[PDB]
Amino acid sequence: SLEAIVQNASSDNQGIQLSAVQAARKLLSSDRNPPIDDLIKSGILPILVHCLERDDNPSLQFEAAWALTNIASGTSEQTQAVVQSNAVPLFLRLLHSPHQNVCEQAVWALGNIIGDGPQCRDYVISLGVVKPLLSFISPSIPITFLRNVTWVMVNLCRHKDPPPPMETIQEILPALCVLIHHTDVNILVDTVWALSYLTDAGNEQIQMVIDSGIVPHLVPLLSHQEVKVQTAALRAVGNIVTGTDEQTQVVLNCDALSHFPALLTHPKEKINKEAVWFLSNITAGNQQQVQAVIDANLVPMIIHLLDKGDFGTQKEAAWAISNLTISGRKDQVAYLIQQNVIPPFCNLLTVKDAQVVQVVLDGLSNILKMAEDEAETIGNLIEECGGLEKIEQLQNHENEDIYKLAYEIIDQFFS
């Protein structure tokens, strides 16, 4: 009797209330076809939200929290019905309940709400969720509960186009510093993905992450046995090394490069690609960082991937080679030449990704300009592998930066 349940829940007698709220909860969480929509149309939601305030009856508070949780675990329309009934401030309140089960049910409901979309997430942040959420992280916490805590932290951290507030980041980072030493794979995945979302927000957030002290704990996860950890960590440090040279050097000082031979040869193409992206951000640095890439014996592996990798990896390797020519010294570029970069580099001149074509022409141009006396030898190598015919054809490309640079190269070195 759904009507009866609604009427009884509104009674002043708290035991009849408990019976009714328990009945609604049992209708919702006990079957594989719950009547969620029917309970919403009944008008029960504001009653349950009122029940969440009853600290003097924790069984009633628990049951109402569980009912609303299960409604919020449903479809987007069901979660939004919960949000529109003003449930959120009451769940944030229940994060400070002394009763663990009410706290766990509040975390779960808030997770579903935050997951519905960006404005609900930003509402929950604006109401102060982070401090009480992170307060749960302790040595005695059950792992299932901690997993739900960390999932909510990731989801608070993930929609980036709204940058989360800086002060929230200051609250979240100490928790990540704690969690990065956890052994549970799901906790590590969530912690590191959260870090990678923070590190994608800009150089100032990168600096906050650096200043937290977490990078020497983060870098070694590049060699974790679990691939999900490896790929989260590779994203996080790659984003750090999109920052300044000094921020990149923070990563290098952790011996990051020692992890890369096993990433360039990893069976997963996605790890090869992400690793070469990382390296391309190292070679865009100063002469010493270029030399760090050379001295780690990584250049032959990059050139191999430039030649035989999947296109996404090939594009990243093209960037890594061309970026090396930005600040690299003549002898470092000469080392590239000795390692037979030219044929596979020139083989990318014919692809449909115009950005890659431009990158390759930029690198070839830089190489030719840098070889004071050997420019003729290098021009001959470019000719031998068909690079010259390809450059000649690029004079007719639609894109002005390409055809201009092809003309300039042809005028300076093959005329």
Residue numbers in the entry: 72 to 486
Please give sentences taken from the publication describing this entry.
Active transport of proteins from the cytoplasm to the nucleus is mediated by a family of nuclear transport receptors known as importins (or karyopherins), together with a number of ancillary proteins including nucleoporins and Ran1–3. The W proteins of henipaviruses share a common N-terminal domain with P and V proteins, but have a unique NLS bearing C-terminal domain that is recognised preferentially by importins α3 and α4 (KPNA4 and KPNA3), rather than the better characterised importin α1 (KPNA2).
To extend on the structural repertoire of importin α structures, we tested whether these ARM repeats are similar in the structures of importin α isoforms that do not contain bound cargo. Importin α1 and α3, crystallised in P212121 and P1211 space groups, respectively, both contained one chain in the ASU. Superposition of importin α3 in the cargo free and bound forms showed that the N-terminal ARM repeats 1–4 are repositioned by up to 5 Å, consistent with previous findings that a more flexible hinge region is present in importin α315. However, the position of ARM repeats 7 and 8 was retained in both the cargo free and bound forms of importin α3. These results suggest that ARMs 7 and 8 do not undergo conformational changes to accommodate binding of the W NLS in either importin α1 or α3. In addition, we show through structural comparisons between apo- and W bound-importin α3, that structural changes in the N terminus were not associated with direct binding interactions in this region. The study by Sankhala et al. 15 indicated that the NLS of RCC1 binds in the major binding site of ARMS 2–4 of both importin α1 and α3, with additional interactions occurring at the N terminus of importin α3 ARM repeats 1–4 and the β-propeller region of RCC1, mediated by flexibility and rotation of importin α3 in ARM repeats 1–2. This mechanism of isoform specificity is well suited to cargo containing NLSs at the N terminus, and our structural data of the unbound and NLS-bound forms of importin α3 supports this model.
